[PDB]
Amino acid sequence: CPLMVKVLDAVRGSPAINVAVHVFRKAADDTWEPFASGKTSESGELHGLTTEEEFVEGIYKVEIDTKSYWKALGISPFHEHAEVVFTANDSGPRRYTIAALLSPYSYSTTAVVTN
Template structure:
């Protein structure tokens, strides 16, 4: 159980928001970059379901997109530059399904950043 808690602490700290792509690169269309690492196994966390939400005017959360991390634990296409307007966002990582696929009993069902 303790190692799963440690994983989640590192997992929450390893979500990156980046607009550092060169203007003409393929990633320049995608201003949000997510990298998920499994610090317990020392490797990327593939196939983790990730949901992107934006806070609405009434304080509720609107689901904008959902995808899974690739084999490198990365997501590049959660939103486009045009859709990524000023506001408050959160990312929800479905850690429950990740741990279940590894045959482990999850301590947390998800992590929000």
């Protein structure tokens, strides 16, 4: 897994389960082309989005559907989604972990980049 997404719920103190995640890659014509998508598991993790071969150099956008997550719990949140945009693999292949913590009116995201 060159790209992994982990999402936590700050209100329930739990993994954020069944959270839709969409990954895009900036095309040559500056458009966002769909790259991969999935949903977080029971552990709040999303594995197997892509492969080392497919995950080339580029600018990527990870869009976490936080709104749908909070709605399903009967909460009307502030954000439409949580976005993470980053240039990947510019100095060679790396392993990326995108961690997100969710509150109805707040979110934080951090990146763990290893070799």
